[PDB]
Design a protein around this nucleic acid. Sequence first.
RNA 1: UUCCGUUAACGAACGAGACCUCAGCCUGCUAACUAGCUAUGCGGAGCCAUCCCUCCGCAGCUAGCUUCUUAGAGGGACUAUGGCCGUUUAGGCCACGGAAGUUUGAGGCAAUAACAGGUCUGUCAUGCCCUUAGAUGUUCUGGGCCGCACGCGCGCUACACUGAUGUAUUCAACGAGUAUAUAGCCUUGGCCGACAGGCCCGGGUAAUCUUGGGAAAUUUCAUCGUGAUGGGGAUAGAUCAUUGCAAUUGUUGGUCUUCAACGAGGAAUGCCUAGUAAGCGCGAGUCAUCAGCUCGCGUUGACUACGUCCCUGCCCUUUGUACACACCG
Lengths: 193, 77, 140, 135, 39, 103, 64, 136
Amino acid sequence: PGGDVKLFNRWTFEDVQVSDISLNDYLAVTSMKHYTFLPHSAGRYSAKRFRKAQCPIIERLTNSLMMHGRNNGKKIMAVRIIKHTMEIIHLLTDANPIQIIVDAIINSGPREDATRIGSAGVVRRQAVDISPLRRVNQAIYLLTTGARESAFRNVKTIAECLADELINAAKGSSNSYAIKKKDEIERVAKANR
Amino acid sequence: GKQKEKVNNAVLFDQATYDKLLTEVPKYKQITPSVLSERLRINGSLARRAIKDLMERGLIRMVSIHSSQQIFTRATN
Amino acid sequence: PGTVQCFGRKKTAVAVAYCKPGRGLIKVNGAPIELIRPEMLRLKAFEPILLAGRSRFKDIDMRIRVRGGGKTSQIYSIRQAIAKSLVAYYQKYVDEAAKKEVKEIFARYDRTLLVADPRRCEPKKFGGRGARARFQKSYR
Amino acid sequence: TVKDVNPHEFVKAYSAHLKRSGKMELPEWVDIVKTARFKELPPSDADWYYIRAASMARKIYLRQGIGIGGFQKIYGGRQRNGSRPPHFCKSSGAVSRNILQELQKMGIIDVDPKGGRLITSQGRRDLDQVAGTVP
Amino acid sequence: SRVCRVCGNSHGLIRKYGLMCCRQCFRSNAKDIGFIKYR
Amino acid sequence: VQHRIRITLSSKSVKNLEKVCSDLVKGAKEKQLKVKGPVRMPTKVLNITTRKSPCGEGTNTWDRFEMRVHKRVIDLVSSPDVVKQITSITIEPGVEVEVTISD
Amino acid sequence: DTQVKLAVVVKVMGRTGSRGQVTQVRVKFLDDQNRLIMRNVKGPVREGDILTLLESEREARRLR
Amino acid sequence: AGEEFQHILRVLNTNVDGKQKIMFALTSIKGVGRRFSNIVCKKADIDMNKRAGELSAEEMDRLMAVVHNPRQFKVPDWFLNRKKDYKDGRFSQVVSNAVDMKLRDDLERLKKIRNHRGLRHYWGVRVRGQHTKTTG
RNA sequence: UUCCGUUAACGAACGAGACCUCAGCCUGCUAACUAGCUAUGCGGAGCCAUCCCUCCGCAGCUAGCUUCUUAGAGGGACUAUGGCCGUUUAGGCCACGGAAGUUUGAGGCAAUAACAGGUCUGUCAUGCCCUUAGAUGUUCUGGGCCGCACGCGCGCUACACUGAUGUAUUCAACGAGUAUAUAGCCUUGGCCGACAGGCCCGGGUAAUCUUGGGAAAUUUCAUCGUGAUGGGGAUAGAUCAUUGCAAUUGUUGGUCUUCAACGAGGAAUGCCUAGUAAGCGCGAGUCAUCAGCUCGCGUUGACUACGUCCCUGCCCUUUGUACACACCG
Ligand SMILES: [Mg+2]
Ligand SMILES: [Mg+2]
Ligand SMILES: [Mg+2]
Ligand SMILES: [Mg+2]
Ligand SMILES: [Mg+2]
Ligand SMILES: [Mg+2]
Ligand SMILES: [Mg+2]
Ligand SMILES: [Mg+2]
Ligand SMILES: [Mg+2]
Ligand SMILES: [Mg+2]
Ligand SMILES: [Mg+2]
Ligand SMILES: [Mg+2]
Ligand SMILES: [Zn+2]
């Protein structure tokens, strides 16, 4: 459409396609209104329910790096990490690293979960489905924490750690913390079905 | 990797990264970063952040130096 | 007969753009907007430029000044100030239908370019270090 | 000019400039001090006495009536008191004193009545030339 | 060596602005001093 | 003969204070003086925070006391005896005025 | 070998769970649009949301 | 290029490691810390980007000279760690093994004297006016 | 217990709300050489240089200046408008508009009845008792309140590479400043010193001088490269200066050295829903000096949820009671 808007001016949002029509609504990459130059924005989100569903996906992945106390409150470092990871994804796959981000989030969102329902007067955990927004929430969180701990006390630095996790989760291989936790949750829920 | 403690051992300053190891390490995708490959060529940093300087005057690859000294790689063009 | 001096605001940062009918020039505290110095938030400063384009700036000079605030607050205040200064200059000196296109280009991407953000660091109450938290509580 | 030049590369260029554009005297305690009480090591660069002077050149450039204490404060930083909470700690006096005295001895800056340090016109000439000679 | 102007005790003083009265005397007489408590 | 005079004027209460401000401005402008004011000068906020308990028991509760001191300044160009022709009109309770002779 | 099947949430009936944390919704199947089933859903879910669904023939019961 | 690359140098009875920077290997000696290592490197005028292991023999002699006779280098009195002695009264840098002997001389004065501090050490508890309800 | 409405009740009184303070909007009004734009006039420096153009300096009978700053009066939101639900009542959910659509955000104040809640150690507030000269009265000296096998509570520093160190870069807000004598509380400026801190000229009872707060985090370039390392700064020695009439059981601050535990913490448990948590610094209180604390202030700035009565509790109704000091019955 009208898409002469590239994040960091150099990674075209155009020609990115989401596989899940389920997460199509909740991934902010498609509409001409969801394109942004930078994954930093002083958005008045969380002021209302579901308003985060229209947060830019890159921004809503950016907010999840800045965690564990020493890193709380500093988005400039987070967006710097995002920039370096995003360019290194390109420097390996030579394909739209935006599409890499999106496809990884598709392929690492738990589709079923076992929680603690009670019925008939008796409470015991059972399997339930996962609404797509919480799909995305867990995807973001669970891809990110893998990079955090896999780069902790490690000379490999966070940009390349998170790049490894993204490239390999999007590729689909079970070599990432993310997709390893995915099928673990999936199998606990399948057993408890 | 013990890669700044091993900086003066003559193997590194003689043949290892003098386009014998990090000539083929970039070649996996034809461009694989020096900071990414800090562990694919397991050799860690500052015996590596200096050999990147050596390879830039040796004129074999392009350079991108930025915030946390995130530096990169490109094999031949 | 162009001269407009329009402001934009953030937490405490205030940005004021005083203008001339000049050629293309844009300066923050004498330093070109090219040298705005969060070098990851260097997009947002050019973003009102990058949405309108230099073509809407071949007749204007902006000696924009910024005081108070922090760093990102000041940058977002730049963004608001230049956006509103362009809209006001167009409205009063070009055409209202002409500024309406600027209105819609800016607002389609985001509303926060033109509308101030009413958020402030709300005060801290006793019984804790923090405006909403408390001290850790011990029973035994 | 210097407001058009990236604030870092101008410092680099001027640091080289007040090396090769003649010479001056220099104290024989430069390779000892920490330049601040909260610091832990002396500067890792050798010509830090020159990069410092390049920075303090443009300070009096773009601001007037600056005393020694103003530079003490501007060049302080975070002091990590150990197990105590960290604070803000002002920098050293003698280092800034000798930077200002050196620049005065080349007549780049000079002490103003009503107090403070102000640039001179030929120092302005020099800073603008070295600014223009940067990409 | 310094006490309240009001009760002449040695703790809880309010030295600021030169009151020389303790935290208790100060509240007890605060409204007539003029410390309107808008918040 | 015609000299320059300052009047500074402070208080605790805005409603009381502004009545005096309108008073002197109209007092001057009935007699056509060269006046400028009343410059409004930022409010001082005296504040003392106190533990409202007298013995230190129960949940820690503080109360914040504050005075607001308001400052106003006006310049007049007239002789000081002409000034005393004005500043004998009634002055409202609580307001303070400190006419001084300036350059 | 179940092929994961899709549904849209036509209305959110309620919010069951001991801690009130499992939305109970009523889904309509995309692949054949006359099958409507009451399921349990966790997290924020609104009307018109498309849900992937691994195993289809399970359904919940009113106020489960 | 470590034709004679040394893994441990063994100056001053510490086995100074020959694998880390000379900047922060000379700190392994008990009596020379981070700052005084730098000042010695400066005054002995040795190349800075130099891992111990590659360094040459004449300049260990230079470090020897500048660590046992630092003062003659016009270095001020106030890097030195035995400022204004009361055994004699000079200004010297104590080095690896002698530091414990010097500390024993201090505490051993304190023992002979019956100083509160000397007892407090002999008693074992904190010596500098600290609380001891809840720490130590 | 807000209202509609029902109605052996009618009509009322508090609490809620209403009220006040701060914050958010106003190119609308009042103004402001103790605020700041704007223009011109010269100056300085860069320059197709000769003018122009860019950035600074200084001043005014420059404003047919108040947008930025301040502070007064005001204006503004009312669910007002539309859709849907609802007896189409009370209202709710949604949408445009708008600065604001959880009363817009946060507080202040805050009812009846009570507690053997705390305070006789805030008080020439106090009843009764004790003491009342060889004093539990007052003053002084020295010590003590800080002692340490240990257990607990609030906290600070971390366990690092999303880092530490060393350069460069530059951004606030809240407030604070006795005749304090021979310049003296905040201290600008010059000088000496590596530092600590000294000397001299002074400024300010303050939008005037401090400070137009030149804060840090963060940003940038290198140094360390996974190692209890350059993380950590505990401990301890040497010495230097300031506050003090006095520094010892080191007041504090420097300088060199000494370089511990701590590999993200068991059972358990706390705080938190938007500029909020958390990270980061400043100011005030205390103060002759000592701030890891407390109260304020801003800076950067999120994940999650928009629910439920499962845990702990609260309010109403019904029901049961062998309880009333009330289930700790
Ligand atoms: Mg890392
Ligand atoms: Mg309220
Ligand atoms: Mg009682
Ligand atoms: Mg006594
Ligand atoms: Mg005690
Ligand atoms: Mg507490
Ligand atoms: Mg350290
Ligand atoms: Mg203090
Ligand atoms: Mg206390
Ligand atoms: Mg609890
Ligand atoms: Mg009974
Ligand atoms: Mg019982
Ligand atoms: Zn009292």
